[PDB]
Structure formats: C-alpha cells, structure tokens
Amino acid sequence: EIETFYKMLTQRAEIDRAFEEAAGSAETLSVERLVTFLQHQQREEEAGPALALSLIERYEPSETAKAQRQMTKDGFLMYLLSADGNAFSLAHRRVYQDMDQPLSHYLVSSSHNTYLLEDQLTGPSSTEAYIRALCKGCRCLELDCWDGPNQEPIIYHGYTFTSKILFCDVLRAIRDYAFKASPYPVILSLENHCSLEQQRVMARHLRAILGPILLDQPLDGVTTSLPSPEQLKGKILLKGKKLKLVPELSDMIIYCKSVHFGGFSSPGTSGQAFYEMASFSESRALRLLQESGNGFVRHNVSCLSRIYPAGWRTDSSNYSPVEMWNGGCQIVALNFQTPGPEMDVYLGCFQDNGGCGYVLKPAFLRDPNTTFNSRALTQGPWWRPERLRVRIISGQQLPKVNKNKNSIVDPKVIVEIHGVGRDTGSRQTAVITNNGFNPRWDMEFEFEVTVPDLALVRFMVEDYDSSSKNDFIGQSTIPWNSLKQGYRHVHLLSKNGDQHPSATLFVKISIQD
Ligand SMILES: O=P1(O)C[C@@H]2[C@H](O)[C@@H](O)[C@H](O)[C@@H](O)[C@@H]2O1
Ligand SMILES: [Ca+2]
Ligand SMILES: [Ca+2]
Ligand SMILES: [Ca+2]
C-alpha cells in the first residue's frame, strides 16, 4: 500500500495517456519516437535527434534508457516539468533580442514612486522598495527629492504623510543593485524640489556615489538618435529638467530632458528631440491614444514617452500597461509594490528577453512611417490572426491560500488574452471542489488573436468562494511569442511574483494560422 500510495498520490493519467500516444505500444520512447513528439506535439522548430538526445541526457532517470538513447515515462514527466517543458519558452529566458537599437525601440521596465512600499498618502518609503524593484528587473526608477535637515536631501511623496528616506541612502542601494538583474542601463527620473544648495548636494552625492556608473557626458557618435541598451550597458542615466536649477545637476541630464508634451510633428518635421522625454498621466495618455493613436505611436518610435498612474490611485493601484504598450509607450511606470493582474502582466512581459528589462518592440512599432493604430485596425504586418487552443488539463499541488484554517481548495482556472482591445478575452473553467492536489478539468478554450505580437496569455487560478470573493491561488502570464506549444506545465506564481515551487497547471497549447 505504501507502494500503491506514493504510487497513487503520485499518479497522473493525463501524463500516462500523453506518454502512451507518443510512445505507443513501447514502454519507452526511442529517439525517433521522441523526435516526432517534439515536432508533432511540442512543435519544436529545432526538432531533431539533437534536441531529443539532450532532453534524454538532461532528463532521463533510467541509466539503462539513458545510455540506450531512450526515454521512459519518468523521464517524459521530468522533461514536461522542466524548464524545457515550461509553457514559457526557455529560449526567451535569456537575452536573445537585438540590443543595438535606440532606447525608444524597447519597452522598458519602469516603476512609479519607487521609494514607496504601500499607499501614496501615509505609507512608508524605504531603500528596500528600490532594492525590490531593481531585483525584479526594473530599469527606470523614480526619485522625489525634497530638501532635508542638515543639508541632506530627502525622498518622499511631496505634500503627503508618507515616511521619508535619504537621497544618499537611496543612491547607495541603487548603486548596489542596479545591475544585479540585468546589465542594461538604469534610468533615474528625478523630480527635483530642492533648494539650489541641496541640489548641489544631490549632484555631489550622484558623482560621489555613482561615480563611473553615472553617465555624465554624451556618447561619442550618438548624434541623431538615443544610444542603445548595448551602448549604455552598465550605466545609469539621469532623467530630469535641463537648463531655479543648478548647472551641476542640469549638466548631468544628457539623453532624457523632461519636457512638457508639445504635440506630434507629423504636420511638420521636428517636434521633441530624441533626447527629450515627455510624461503623461494615465488619463491623458488614454485620451491621446483615443484621438491620436497613430500620432502617439509614430511619436514613440524615436522618442521615449513615460506614463504614470492617475492621481486618484492613492492606494497605489495600477492601470493596465498593455493599453500603453499598444501605443508604443515605453516607460510605462507602475507601482511595483502592488500585487495584482497589472503587475502580473507587467512582469510577464519583462520575463521575456532574459528579464534584462528592455524588450524590443514589434517592427511596425519601430517604423516612423507606420499607419498602425491598435484602436483602428487596418491591414498591415501587425494583422496576423492566429487561433489559440488551450486545454486546461489538470493542476498539481495548488498552494493553500491561507484560509487561516484547514480547508481544501475548490480551484478553477481563468485564461485571459491581453493585447489590442479587439483581442482581449477571458474564459474560465468549472470549479473542482475540495482538490488542490490534483484537480482535473480537461477543459479547452479557443481564442482568435489578430495582433498576437501585442498579446499575452494569462492563466489564473482562484479558490472559489460561494459567499465571498474567490481567493487568488496562483498565476502566470506569458507573452504570445514565448508561448510554447504541446503539452506543457504552467509554473504558478504567488501574488508577489514569487515562484511557487511545485504549483503547476498541465496544459496543451496549440497555435494555428
Ligand atoms: O509622486 P509623483 O510626483 C510621481 C508621478 C509622476 O511620475 C509625475 O510625473 C507627476 O507629476 C506626479 O504628479 C505623480 O506623483
Ligand atoms: Ca514622483
Ligand atoms: Ca473546500
Ligand atoms: Ca472556495
């Protein structure tokens, strides 16, 4: 029975079935019978004996089967639970994109009022908040500088009761973590409310603390465009007002001068210099996208636009980033402290390209002459309908979302499509009652996605509550082009972005044009 049990508790039919079909009669998968699976099922492009063999070498537990170039059901499952079996493309989990274009061509991971740990009104500020963001790959941070006691500038949310911290303390932390998660440039957005004296102090600290990391001179060459992530690699650039403002500071603003939004230079030649960055509240941006979608887009090709949360979000809530990315907006600032679908999608997007924090925009969003407008879709390269079929097969060890008691989860799965408005959709499965160890739904959904290049597929698992609002159990957001096909496992994350060791969803994905 001790056999039966570990052999029972640990026993997945869907897995068995999958092995069967692949292996057929055999009790094993031969390199050829693995290749066809890799091609027919997993749709690997690099399908071939080479891959198969590495899979077997990497995952096969049986020394006999290994040595004999075969895969057992055990190795089959291990492959399926590995980084290679992940629905989130392993290949995309390393920098693999063109890092040589001007900054304006990349979506950049950006945070809003980075110093804040909670609400915008009375919650605390901390260097920790900066460390956290940086550790999540954030590239563009915010510093709200105000004069402090003893000629030491402080950082906090002006005009509120949020707790304070030292500008210098913040600089050390940024210094210490700026590149822990990526080698690409960090941008510091300074909102400067300092007296000229304390501004001088700021400049002193910047130089003193950042030293060589700090970029304080234009890049030789770099004449008509913003440098590239590659060119700025290992650097930290300041973004702010450039000559009420001491030269010491103004002189350090090189590639990102804060400017008031002029408008878009289509009816002319020039508008904002590539080294000029405009900011838009969530609200204004929406409006501009609503009326000037293509203008904004075209603007965003050579120019970096920063977007920030609406003033009413004193709770540090977040808006949807997708809507801004659809306009090619690059520095879409969110409140990194706040868990929710928005940050889920945010970090899902940025888990791409090895999480270096810079993700190359689609080509049509890099064409100054594009006619694209996610709002008014016409024919163009962006238009490329695909049919996605996702089968939510089963769940493994869904985490017990507290309950402050001994209950059993009643899980259900929601699958969502995020992208151009036309494509957004959501579907949900039934609820399996009292089972988190191995609920089985075996439900399939199909979605039509017309602009996959801007889409993300999100899997969310909730604990169905009849009386209350359903608890969130886990989630995973995968950018369209990183979505792997065939049988895969979706590795669920907690609301804080943390990896849930053994919580997975087993699915079968198929994308067809
Ligand atoms: O704490 P904040 O200054 C950060 C945020 C923006 O990024 C600024 O562009 C804007 O002007 C402020 O109103 C907003 O509150
Ligand atoms: Ca601010
Ligand atoms: Ca229950
Ligand atoms: Ca429930």
Torsion sign (Cα): 350, 355, 357, 358 = negative
In terms of DSSP bridges, do strands 499-512 and 386-396 run parallel, antiparallel, or are they unpaired?
A: antiparallel
Could you count the other beta carbons within 10 Å of the beta carbon of residue 17?
12
Residues listed for the chain: 513
What residues have CB less than 8 Å from 508, skipping those under 6 apart? Answer: 390, 391, 393, 486, 487, 488
Tell me whether residue 154 is annotated as binding.
Answer: no
Which residue's C-alpha comes closest to atom 13 of ligand 1? 311
CB burial of residue 42 (10 Å; 0-12, 13-18, 19+):
buried
Task: Determine the residue type at 213.
Answer: I
Active site residue 299: no
Q: Is 112 a catalytic residue?
A: yes
What's phi and psi for 91, nearest 5 deg? -55, -40
346 is in an annotated binding site: no
d(CA 392, CA 449): 19
How deeply is 97 buried, as exposed, middle or buried, from its count of CB atoms within 10 A (0-12, 13-18, 19+)?
middle
Closest of 369, 323, 366 to residue 342, by C-alpha: 323
Q: What are phi and psi of 208, to 5 degrees?
A: -55, -45
Question: What are the φ and ψ backbone dihedral angles of 440, each rounded to 5 degrees?
Answer: -130, 125
Helix (H, G, I), strand (E, B) or coil at 60: coil
| Residue of 40, 92, 105, 112 with catalytic role | 112
Q: How many CB atoms lie within 10 A of CB 345?
A: 23
List of domains in the chain: 11-93 (1.10.238.10), 94-382 (3.20.20.190), 383-513 (2.60.40.150)
Enter the resolution in angstroms: 2.5
* Alpha carbons 327 and 323: distance in angstroms, whole number: 7
Residue with tokens 């040589």: 100
Answer yes or no: are the C-beta atoms of 108 and 325 closer than 8 Å: no
What φ, ψ does residue 97 adopt, rounded to 5°? -100, 170
User: Which residue's structure tokens are 């991971």?
Assistant: 109
Closest Cα to residue 420, out of 459, 383, 458, 475? 383
Q: Token digits for 272? A: 């904002």
Cα–Cα separations (whole angstroms), residue 15 to 20, 81, 128: 9, 11, 43
182 and 137 Cβ atoms separated by less than 8 Å: yes
Please give the distance, rounded to the nearest whole angstrom, from the Cα atom of residue 410 to the centre of ligand 3: 5
Name every residue whose Cβ is closer than 8 Å to that of residue 233 and which is 6 or more positions away in sequence: 183, 184, 185
Three-state SS for 490? strand
**Protein residue closest via CA to atom 6 of ligand 1:** 308
Q: How big is the CA angle at 346 (ends 210 and 316), to the nearest 5 degrees?
A: 80
